[PDB]
């Protein structure tokens, strides 16, 4: 047989699916592991039959188990499911979003203090700036990237972006499509404003003293046209 360690895993998953099937046939509402194994075994079966595409299965398995076919809170506990199976074209990953239909019960439920919005970067002075991606390809810029050092494809008043970053949620990026024009909101960088790296236009404190040197380096390197 030459059973690989991954094949040995799949036997257990498949057997768990078979036990879950038996319990559903008995009329029992399936729990979290039973529900996952029941859907996993279906995917593994269809893959072996090699008549359905990954695309077909991803669609077919949404709400494969209905809210009344599982215990309360099971649907919300499993927002997505992933199962690798061998298809005629090889092993492919079947990714299902909402495999089990949710209900009103939620384990690990978060109840907010207030529905009021969170004021991020509070008290920082906003700078409105028009930017144009004159490049042939779209690009994104992160929340903490030194805006002044962004891809030379971006056309904007760089002097006004010196020592500033995007006033967007931490970890988010702003997209500027090829040819697209946008109004960005910039705020001054926190801490000491010791900008080291990126495009190396600054590599030091973003003070007035470093500004002329930084603008000259930006012009020389093609960021300022």
């Amino acid at each position: 047989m030459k059973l690989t360690p991954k094949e040995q895993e799949k036997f257990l998953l498949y057997y768990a699916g078979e036990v879950a099937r038996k319990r559903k046939e008995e009329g029992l509402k399936l729990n979290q592991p039973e529900a996952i194994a029941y859907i996993s075994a279906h995917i593994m079966d269809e893959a072996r039959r090699g008549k359905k595409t990954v695309a077909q299965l991803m669609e077919e398995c949404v709400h494969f188990l209905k809210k009344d076919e599982v215990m309360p809170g099971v649907g919300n506990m499993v927002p997505d499911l992933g199962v690798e199976a061998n298809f005629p074209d090889g092993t492919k990953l079947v990714t299902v979003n909402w495999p089990i239909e949710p209900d009103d019960f939620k384990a690990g439920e978060i109840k907010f203090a207030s529905d009021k919005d969170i004021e991020l970067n509070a008290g920082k002075e906003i700078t409105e700036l028009k930017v144009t991606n004159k490049g042939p390809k779209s690009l994104h810029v992160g929340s903490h990237f030194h805006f002044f050092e962004a891809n030379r494809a971006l056309e904007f008043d760089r002097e006004k972006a010196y020592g500033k970053r995007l006033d967007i949620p931490s970890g988010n990026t702003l997209r500027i499509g090829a040819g697209e024009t946008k109004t960005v909101h910039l705020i001054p960088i926190g801490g000491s404003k010791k900008i080291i790296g990126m495009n190396g236009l600054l590599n030091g404190i973003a003070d007035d003293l470093h500004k002329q040197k930084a603008l000259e380096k930006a012009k020389h390197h093609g960021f300022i046209k």
Partner: protein, 564 residues
């Protein structure tokens, strides 16, 4: 900029004032404080915060963290708050706001995210200390994966393996057996500490055991828990700063409960299965829990009190102790009264610890679920604690978490190293998804490394595909396990080079400050009272008021999560 509350919570997890449901229980944890600066939160990923010269510093710093647990919701006796956790040199380096002071506001000075920092996203996760199971019968090495899979990182107790002595008692008796077990311990990821035979009316035999590496002694009735034994054992423990654990004289052969208490003479002692179904003076052993010097714990089978608790015991006692089928009952009248009271005593902070009694009248991977099932049961029966401030169960949560984290650590003299989420302590932490809190952990960190975690298909394109099951990680393997695991010993053994002498490669640390730990020393479970048992009705009384609870027909953190 103004961010929608739902979007903030999805991205970074809950903030100040938000309430989190613990698993499928009716317990609500409220975020007491958030240590972040809104807009400066760390996020890992493509185009995110933790990047060269942005959230990640380019400036060298002596406090560059080895690991950062971003946007964690800490649940500990120290508080229920939101913070970034910084690990360095396998210890909790800092708790607060991590990042780069060069580009960010409000960064905790000793929480530098740099080139050498690894990232772990804790946004929307609950971070707790690793559990300490102070009632382990070292019967089977297979208990260790089961324990880790249930958030337990440290195990105190004793054994030799599947032999009658161990099967019954947490005892690794004598020098040779202690040396053998301490050397066997090298294999595992679990932190260990061994107890020797305390059942002796002779000094020499007790001293030999402490010097052999024992972290204390277990006095167990199977070797005769007589008043002479109790006194001799405590005398040696006092001399050597080690803990004593006790399973009292069930049959009241040499005396009643008061005779045992008298023999102890106000000296520090850890009272296992205080309720008495697991063993001890019938029917009044529970009365010991009211005493200041008595450090009491509970074993998993009697917590919570369910409709099947009594039925299960009236047979489970016969398989463990190997009793005649001629024996039918006494336990049928005695047991309901004390099992019920025990749950309320936990809620009152009278019983300070929860333990397992693993494969010897108790379950290895049940300490954590059963503690939260009891917390939930009481909340459901008695309602929100009067002690609570606001629409939350923070006080109850803190009372219950202390039972399996800090309080066992205080009892065994390891509170300076482990037991809680505090700066300076060893990084033995557990990451939980709130929907699975108390039932199924995500990641187990020991000594700053991931040692055990839930993991999907080994071949798979991502770590999520089925079957997702618990597996050993890098920190549990090779010579890295010697860097992440601790073998606790007595100060005498430690100071006399037990590590070198036994050729132990694991971290060897001494247990210290066992002798002067009273009820007053515990966290959220310092309650002392006059506990009495009616010798006719078997009802339990706390300062003259009937102490009881109703049996549960169903429990939380059970049926929704398990296949079998």
């Amino acid at each position: 900029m103004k961010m929608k509350r739902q979007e903030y919570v999805n991205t970074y997890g809950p903030t100040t004032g938000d309430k989190v449901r613990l698993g499928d229980t009716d317990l609500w944890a409220e975020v007491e404080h958030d240590y972040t600066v809104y807009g400066e939160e760390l996020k890992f990923g493509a185009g995110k915060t933790i990047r060269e010269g942005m959230g990640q510093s380019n400036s060298p710093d002596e406090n560059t963290l080895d690991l950062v647990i971003t946007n964690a919701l800490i649940i500990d006796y120290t508080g229920i708050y939101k913070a970034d956790i910084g690990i360095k040199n396998g210890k909790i380096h800092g708790i607060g706001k991590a990042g780069n002071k060069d580009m960010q506001d409000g960064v905790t000075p000793h929480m530098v995210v740099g080139v050498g920092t690894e990232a772990l996203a804790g946004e929307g996760m609950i971070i707790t200390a690793g559990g300490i199971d102070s009632h382990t019968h070292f019967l089977s090495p297979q208990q260790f994966p089961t324990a880790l899979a249930n958030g337990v990182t440290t195990m105190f107790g004793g054994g030799t393996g599947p032999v009658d002595g161990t099967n019954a008692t947490t005892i690794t008796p004598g020098v040779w057996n202690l040396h053998r077990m301490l050397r066997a311990a090298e294999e595992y990821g679990m932190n260990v500490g061994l107890l020797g035979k305390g059942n002796s009316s002779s000094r020499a035999q007790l001293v030999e055991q402490v010097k052999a590496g024992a972290i204390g002694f277990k006095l167990h009735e199977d070797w005769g828990t007589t008043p002479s034994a109790i006194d001799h054992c405590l005398s040696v423990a006092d001399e050597y700063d080690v803990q004593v654990c006790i399973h009292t004289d069930t049959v009241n052969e040499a005396g009643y409960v008061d005779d045992t208490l008298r023999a102890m003479n106000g000296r520090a002692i850890h009272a296992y299965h205080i309720e008495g179904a697991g063993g001890g003076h019938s029917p009044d052993v529970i009365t010991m829990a009211g005493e200041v010097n008595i450090l009491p714990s509970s074993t998993t089978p009697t917590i919570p009190y369910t409709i099947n608790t009594v039925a299960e015991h009236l047979d489970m006692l016969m398989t463990c102790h190997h009793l005649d089928k001629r024996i039918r009952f006494s336990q049928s009248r005695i047991r309901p009264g004390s099992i019920a009271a025990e749950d309320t005593l936990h809620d009152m902070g009278v019983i300070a610890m929860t333990s397992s009694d693993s494969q010897a009248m108790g379950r290895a991977g049940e300490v954590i679920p059963r503690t939260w099932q009891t917390a939930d049961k009481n909340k459901k029966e008695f309602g929100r604690l009067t002690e609570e401030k606001g629409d939350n169960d923070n006080f109850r949560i803190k009372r219950y978490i202390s039972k399996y984290t800090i309080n066992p650590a205080i009892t065994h003299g390891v509170s300076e190293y482990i037991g809680s989420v505090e700066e300076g302590k060893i990084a033995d932490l557990v990451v939980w998804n709130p929907a699975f809190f108390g039932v199924k952990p995500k990641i187990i960190i020991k000594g700053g490394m991931v040692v055990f975690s839930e993991m999907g298909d080994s071949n798979a394109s991502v770590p999520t595909p089925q079957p997702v099951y618990y597996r050993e990680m890098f920190g549990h393997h090779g010579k890295a396990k010697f860097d992440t695991s601790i073998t606790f010993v007595s100060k005498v053994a430690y100071e006399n080079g037990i590590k070198e002498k036994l050729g132990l490669e694991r971290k060897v640390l001494p247990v210290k400050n066992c002798r002067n730990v009273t009820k007053k020393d515990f966290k959220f479970n310092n309650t002392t009272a006059k506990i009495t048992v009616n010798p006719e009705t078997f009802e339990v009384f706390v300062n003259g008021k009937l102490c009881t609870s109703k049996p549960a027909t169903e429990v939380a953190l059970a049926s929704r999560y398990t296949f079998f």
